[PDB]
Amino acid sequence: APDWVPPEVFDLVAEDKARCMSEHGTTQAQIDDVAKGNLVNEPSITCYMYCLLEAFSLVDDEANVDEDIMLGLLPDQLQERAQSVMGKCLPTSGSDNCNKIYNLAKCVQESAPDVWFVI
């Protein structure tokens, strides 16, 4: 959604997007809501983000985030901004994997709301 998101990621996520929305009952609208700062703690959306992250090997089975690869995949300017934010917001914490991702998403968005994007 933010205008910085690399064109390539739209194609790259297309397979897992579909699998992850189906697995979690996600709708397009929930996704669109996020860019606008309207993230809700609902499994259809929070587990969807976990699902997408796992598909890119960015989380393990306990929603521990691979910070190095996550940051490495971001464009230059986002990477700089994310380094600080992710130092704060990582390691993840929460009651389950989906909540861990929600907490992370919310933590990032407090300071860098354009940095945590969902598609």
Of the candidate residues 42, 56, 64, 106, the single one contacting ligand NBB (CB under 6 A): 56
The partner in contact with residue 64, picked from its own copies, ligand NBB, none with C-beta cut-offs of 5 to 8 angstroms by kind, is none
Residue 31 CB, nearest distance to ligand NBB (Å)?
7
* 3-class SS of residue 59: strand
Q: Which residues pair with 65 in a beta bridge?
A: 59
Cβ pair 39, 109 in contact under 8 A = yes
Question: Helix %, strand %, coil % for the chain, to 5?
Answer: 60, 0, 35
Report if residue 8 touches its own copies, rule: CB under 8 A. Answer: no
Which of 27/111 has CB closer to its own copies?
111
Look up residue 62 and give its DSSP letter: T
Provide the binding-site residues for its own copies, judged by CB under 8 A: 2-4, 23-25, 35-37, 43, 47, 51, 60-63, 77-78, 80-81, 84, 94-99, 109, 111-115
